[PDB]
Amino acid sequence: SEESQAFQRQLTALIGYDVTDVSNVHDDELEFTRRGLVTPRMAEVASRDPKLYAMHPWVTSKPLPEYLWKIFIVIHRSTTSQTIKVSPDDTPGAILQSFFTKMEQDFVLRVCGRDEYLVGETPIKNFQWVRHCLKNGEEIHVVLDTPPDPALDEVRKCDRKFRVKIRGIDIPVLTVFVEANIQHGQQVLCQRRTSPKPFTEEVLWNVWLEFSIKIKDLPKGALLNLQIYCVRLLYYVNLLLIDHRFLLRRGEYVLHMWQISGNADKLTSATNPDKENSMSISILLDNMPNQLRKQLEAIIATDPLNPLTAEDKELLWHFRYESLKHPKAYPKLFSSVKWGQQEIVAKTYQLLARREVWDQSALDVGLTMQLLDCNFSDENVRAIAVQKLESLEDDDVLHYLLQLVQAVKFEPYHDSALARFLLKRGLRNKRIGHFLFWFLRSEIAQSRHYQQRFAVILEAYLRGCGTAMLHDFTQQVQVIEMLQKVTLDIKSLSQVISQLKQKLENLQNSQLPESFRVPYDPGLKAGALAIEKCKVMASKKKPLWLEFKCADPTANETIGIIFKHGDDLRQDMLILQILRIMESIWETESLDLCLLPYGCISTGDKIGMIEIVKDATTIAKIQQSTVTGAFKDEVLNHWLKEKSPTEEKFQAAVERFVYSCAGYCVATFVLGIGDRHNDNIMITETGNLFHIDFGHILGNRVPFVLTPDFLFVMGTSKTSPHFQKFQDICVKAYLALRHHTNLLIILFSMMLMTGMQLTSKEDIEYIRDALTVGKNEEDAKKYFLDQIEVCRDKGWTVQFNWFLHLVL
Ligand SMILES: Oc1cccc(-c2cc(Nc3cccnc3)nc(N3CCOCC3)n2)c1
């Protein structure tokens, strides 16, 4: 079809990858998956309420934080600005029908400046926007607008032993051999290796590697891992021994292998796209006492990063029907399985059929995600985790969306429950789909390993999001592509800003769309760009500082965005999303630590965009604008007095500081990134503190930053009242997180496995020490205070050293 061609062409443009490409494939799993997903896509399209899907009301079911539990709304019909008081449990329609008396009722209550609507049968106390404005004590300004026409959300019409024959490897450019492994969930079942031979542009063994395992004993999801050596590893490539159709693999295979540069990429079932420079390999296939109860309870009740010994697994397996009673033990129990034995696997399913407990149990995300990591290849084991995810509401789905998208790399096959799940939740929610779009486009644009699997998934989504969405994405992508070139061209080079003003002026011309949607915050529409406000930054990375006029006249603040190439913003995104999670955790405990998880979206290979926090500057700048390595205690406080004249304002900024400082002190501490520098810590003129550039720190001693300039602001020289207010919070905020150890851990693990040659046998096991695991809550309190003491003792010491290091 004429249009169908320009369609697939438009898709590819948005995707950043051509899915109809078939040059880098040895089978049809991808094409098979493209077609498989057609059902979930359309099945979801025809289920979503056109109205609710078009307005995407952002709501929640969770209770209201006590601190907030302790109101009126403004309206803006043109010149008319009627101000009305409403009961908390009033439907937006009831409030609307209430405005009908105090004055074709086919209108809707939108938000001033943003694309956020207040619709549906939901008490206004359940709209995240209202809740947000309360944690700020701001007036809820609503513009009486018309409902958006949903007509724009329409879519386009054998008992023998296993053996493989290694024909040989082909090198593009002394001694070498091939290791043929049989993995399942990162656990090797059998291993064979060829003889060593001197290097040549074509080493031919032509040998039959016989394995001790039998064909029937092969579990679906088992990978055939091929590795080349010299001892050191060089190239690696994988192959599902059982294809998407449950068929045992057969025939000739020539695989182009990925290279090592010494991790999730190690698992990918994809092959190296670049055939020119990739090493290749050709292969041929052609085929209950009290004690032992008390003894395993310790096993069940232990961190996910605690390895199971031989006896652990046996004990755990023998009493499997008793272990299946504790949901917090499933990961452990399914790790105790002999997947390389059909008889054993068959039993585990008999076991899974008896999920009386796991099904009815309250959703534990930390527990759920664990069955989705690299440790599980059994589609059935992984599928029971996705079932629990069906319970999540959008609000929560949005919290773990990033971590879930990454967990797709741990899937054996392209089409999967996890994959289909994201596609379903993204198609029901414009806001979830939006981020799904960029989260996927990010991986596709810097991960040769998983760009194929991901691209297929994104395409399945673009075909369902509707026409409206496609247009927004189109104008978003177009704009983003332009800004990225400018970012690069300028990084290659005051003659600089004169060059920026020049180039930027051309983009402004006519090529760019009038107004585009801010990727890290789709609620916002950025219109006309303010060239006179744009400037290049003074970092060696030389990022761009850009600002746009708010495309909505009923707002006129400028939208500040930063475009930067150099660092990997994927690491930043992960960290920031963890902070947002911590806040929710604290929110359940009526805790607000004023964390500032600014917007950040990776757009490609070590390049992306970052949100600008208004009236915020670097702590380092303050010390050097007043005083370079020299550090005075009064400087910080003086800066506040100045930036906040009204005593009422100043006194509140200090209250906002103590909390924000406590929040970041604890948050960074747990994530093991508290040891930073002044230049990497910022603060709002309103006293709100926050760290930045996380891609820099983890990408390359003091528990956290608690320097005497901070303490001075609290009133410490001398334990001030505020300082006690500080450490009191820290403890409360610290013990809170601990009640989610498992979650923080698995997130921490999936953050490095898919986000960072970071040792998992060491670094990964840092958070264990930090969260005082295996220690009573009371003991934990003392530890954190001890960590604070470390800061009191070092004072400026650490900072001065960072000043040295980052100068010499
Ligand atoms: O996550 C990353 C990664 C790399 C760089 C950053 C990064 C660096 C930076 N530097 C800066 C700004 C102003 C003055 N001096 C230095 N500012 C911000 N912002 C985000 C928060 O709002 C303020 C601007 N982010 C953040």
Swiss-Prot record:
Residues 530-796 form the PI3K/PI4K catalytic domain. Residues 158-286 form the C2 PI3K-type domain. It comes from Homo sapiens (Human). The gene is PIK3CG. Its EC number is 2.7.1.137, 2.7.1.153, 2.7.1.154, 2.7.11.1. It comes from the Eukaryota. Heterodimer of a catalytic subunit PIK3CG and a PIK3R5 or PIK3R6 regulatory subunit. Interacts with GRK2 through the PIK helical domain. Interaction with GRK2 is required for targeting to agonist-occupied receptor. Interacts with PDE3B; regulates PDE3B activity and thereby cAMP levels in cells. Interacts with TPM2. Interacts with EPHA8; regulates integrin-mediated cell adhesion to substrate. Interacts with HRAS; the interaction is required for membrane recruitment and beta-gamma G protein dimer-dependent activation of the PI3K gamma complex PIK3CG:PIK3R6. Belongs to the PI3/PI4-kinase family. It holds the Pfam family PI3K_C2. Residues 71-146 form the PI3K-RBD domain. Keywords: Angiogenesis, ATP-binding, Cell membrane, Chemotaxis, Cytoplasm, Disease variant, Endocytosis, Immunity, Inflammatory response, Kinase, Lipid metabolism, Membrane, Nucleotide-binding, Phosphoprotein, Serine/threonine-protein kinase, Transferase. Residues 288-464 form the PIK helical domain. It catalyses: a 1,2-diacyl-sn-glycero-3-phospho-(1D-myo-inositol) + ATP = a 1,2-diacyl-sn-glycero-3-phospho-(1D-myo-inositol-3-phosphate) + ADP + H(+); a 1,2-diacyl-sn-glycero-3-phospho-(1D-myo-inositol-4,5-bisphosphate) + ATP = a 1,2-diacyl-sn-glycero-3-phospho-(1D-myo-inositol-3,4,5-trisphosphate) + ADP + H(+); a 1,2-diacyl-sn-glycero-3-phospho-(1D-myo-inositol 4-phosphate) + ATP = a 1,2-diacyl-sn-glycero-3-phospho-(1D-myo-inositol-3,4-bisphosphate) + ADP + H(+); L-seryl-[protein] + ATP = O-phospho-L-seryl-[protein] + ADP + H(+). Residues 672-680 are annotated as: Catalytic loop. This is Phosphatidylinositol 4,5-bisphosphate 3-kinase catalytic subunit gamma isoform. Phosphoinositide-3-kinase (PI3K) that phosphorylates PtdIns(4,5)P2 (Phosphatidylinositol 4,5-bisphosphate) to generate phosphatidylinositol 3,4,5-trisphosphate (PIP3). PIP3 plays a key role by recruiting PH domain-containing proteins to the membrane, including AKT1 and PDPK1, activating signaling cascades involved in cell growth, survival, proliferation, motility and morphology. Links G-protein coupled receptor activation to PIP3 production. Involved in immune, inflammatory and allergic responses. Modulates leukocyte chemotaxis to inflammatory sites and in response to chemoattractant agents. ATP binds at residues 560-569, 595-603, 690-698.
